[PDB]
Design a protein around this ligand. Structure first.
Ligand SMILES: *[C@H](O)CCCCCC
Ligand SMILES: *[C@H](O)CCCCCC
Lengths: 255, 255
């Protein structure tokens, strides 16, 4: 039924500034009883897309209703225009996510088991999710990119309002074959026999990264990595991602 | 040293509604290392006065600055116009404070030791502080009423904007000898051999309640209860309580 909506602001030693962070914490009966041990909750790291921040998932979906139904803690950080990268000219936003994961597991009643921790996100956050799935596999059991960018050149060459490509990648004019390419990180993951989280890849059929998503899931089957692809009517809007994260949260908590 | 500013909104099972709550959580090095076990922080329960709520101590003082220098967590809840009582016609806001206490000790890295937990507050919060000090002495080692109300008839018969006495005490025609009388709770604490927390009572000398404060500390001395009383130039405003809460926070965490 109920839960806590928590808004944090702390000085980050990683990115060197105060930063906002919002956390959904569903209510457990352990939390109100002083004589019982706390039961740790499953936790979702939820990554916003470009132009969004730590507030927009709460504002534009009804995710806390979905999270309280399945008693899932949700962590929503803010990474600005970074594409979740340790930026060449800017903040160390790849490392910031591992700091956010470490902090809220130390301070909130969250379970540190691999089988209890998930990660998801949309657009840039979906591209962020597939980066951490392929590079931080022992931290997360399942990963759900929604309408992700899988060929990062489409995100880097995107002409978005005040978006700075050179701030992330520096003087490089291609991201193919580097730590920004999910195809390279996928190749390195199968090469080193690294744990890949359980993949649920969601994208609306009328999205523009739909064909971007079709290329990625086909590449996954050619290298024998299991996934689950759910399509259907949808565009690149919070109307899709509201319904998508509702089915996504139900998918991750039941196994 | 830096810290986290945390604002919670959860459905409270005690008062039967969603309620806002603010938390200062100073940063320890423990919080960012997952190979470290978390060292729990000292905790202060900070109670606002009449017409205020959970936001006003941050807005009108610099308490998070003072709390972070002394690594002290600060818990600031909202109790409306209740005078921290289980109201006859209203919410059970006495029990709510025990619920807030139980909730943040379970979900935040706070020390559950008696010598690490203090309680404080101004005006009506000073009335709440001395009510919980004399009836929950096992939960607090130090209690700091600032500019407080000790003669409960002065608060019940107060003509403040929209304040309702009968919502608190109902048809009662005097507070003496009841659970609303802090002098009565002091007698019952002495008689039942209940541990009285260490008291620091502060009131400015131009306050209306200065003579009210002298009557309680005079009575306190007459039944052989130790206290420390600090006075000086001060009035009934957040300018005095900003400077006083800095003095109180330094007093409570040392020795
Ligand atoms: C990503 O957050 C949304 C912008 C669309 C990117 C298409 C490459
Ligand atoms: C206390 O919260 C502020 C009002 C002054 C009360 C004096 C009886």
């Amino acid at each position: 039924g109920p839960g806590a909506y928590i808004s944090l602001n702390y000085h980050s030693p990683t990115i060197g500034m105060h930063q906002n962070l919002t956390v959904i914490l569903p209510e457990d009966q352990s939390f109100f009883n002083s004589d019982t041990t706390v039961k740790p909750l499953k936790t979702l790291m939820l990554l916003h897309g470009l132009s969004s921040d730590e507030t927009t998932y709460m504002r534009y979906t009804s995710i806390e209703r979905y999270a309280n139904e399945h008693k899932l803690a949700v962590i929503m950080p803010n990474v600005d225009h970074s594409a979740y990268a340790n930026m060449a000219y800017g903040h160390s936003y790849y490392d910031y996510i591992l700091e956010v994961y470490d902090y809220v597991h130390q301070i909130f009643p969250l379970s540190k088991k691999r089988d209890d921790n998930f990660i998801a996100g949309h657009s840039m956050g979906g591209y962020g999710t597939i980066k951490f799935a392929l590079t931080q596999g022992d931290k997360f059991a399942k990963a759900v990119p929604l309408s992700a960018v899988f060929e990062a050149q489409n995100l880097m060459d995107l002409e978005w309002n005040d978006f700075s490509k050179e701030a992330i990648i520096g003087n490089l004019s291609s991201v193919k074959g580097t730590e920004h390419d999910p195809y390279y990180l996928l190749d390195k993951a199968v090469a080193e026999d690294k744990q890949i989280p359980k993949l649920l890849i969601m994208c609306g059929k009328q999205d523009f990264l739909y064909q971007d998503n079709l290329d990625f899931i086909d590449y996954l089957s050619r290298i024998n990595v299991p996934y689950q692809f759910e399509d259907g009517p949808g565009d690149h809007d919070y109307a899709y991602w509201d319904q998508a994260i509702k089915r996504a949260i139900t998918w991750m908590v039941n196994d």
